[PDB]
Design a protein around this nucleic acid. Structure first.
Ligand SMILES: [Mg+2]
Ligand SMILES: [Mg+2]
Ligand SMILES: [Zn+2]
Ligand SMILES: [Zn+2]
Ligand SMILES: [Zn+2]
Ligand SMILES: [Zn+2]
Ligand SMILES: [Zn+2]
Ligand SMILES: [Zn+2]
Lengths: 105, 105
DNA sequence: CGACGCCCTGTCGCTGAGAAGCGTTTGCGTCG
DNA sequence: CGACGCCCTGTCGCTGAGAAGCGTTTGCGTCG
């Protein structure tokens, strides 16, 4: 698949309690799905757990999506706090992402 | 147009005398054509004058295309020398491009 | 290196991906 | 700032562009 997936900014008002209930706690408990899942930028795993929504208009693609364990262990932030933050920008947007590809550059 | 144009490596044996005869000398003498023309990376002008062919396999798109005046005035190299060089890499490939966008980063 | 044990329960490799060009576009300077 | 003159004959702005995910993928260490 060549082209870049769209990036949609979800307001904090549109975040539902069901989405917060589905924030992954342990990476071994993830459920893989090629259709309904979403891909975390850190671990590069496409799973159905709730992931962070980057709210920077300049942000693009799926770089802003992070899972529970990855955001917690690699950046000390909670996905639930990130989803409820109207001004939350992804670590790639802030230029502090430590994934195997971004730290390489 | 969203997607990236292909990059084709032309061996020095395939360079013809007609192509060398069409290397631009003065940027004011260029002929614009949206169909048959090619775009220089430095001046960002799509014209029909012969342009450099970057021979790095890792190179992609049309970043390696430079016109006569731009390569001469901005990098001190001749397009004819570049086209006849089997190991010629574009200034973006060498990370020394001084166009308005690359020097900005 | 893949079995087990520990506490802070965890993450890299490969492929193919990585714009392009039309429009407000061309060096320097006195000078009206 | 857009006419003119100079020699080394020239280049920036805007838009939309800027992957994604399956596969060889999960912290630390003694130890067989
Ligand atoms: Mg490629
Ligand atoms: Mg865009
Ligand atoms: Zn993750
Ligand atoms: Zn972002
Ligand atoms: Zn990253
Ligand atoms: Zn040019
Ligand atoms: Zn190149
Ligand atoms: Zn450049």
């Amino acid at each position: 698949g060549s082209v870049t997936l769209p990036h949609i900014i979800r307001p904090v008002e549109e975040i539902t309690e069901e989405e917060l209930e589905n924030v992954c706690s342990n990476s071994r408990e993830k459920i893989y799905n090629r259709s309904l899942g979403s891909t975390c930028h850190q671990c590069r795993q496409k799973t159905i757990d709730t992931k962070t929504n980057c709210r920077n208009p300049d942000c693009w693609g799926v770089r802003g999506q992070f899972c529970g364990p990855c955001l917690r262990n690699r950046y000390g932030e909670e996905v639930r706090d990130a989803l409820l933050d109207p001004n939350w920008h992804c670590p790639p947007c802030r230029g502090i992402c430590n994934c195997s590809f971004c730290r390489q550059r």
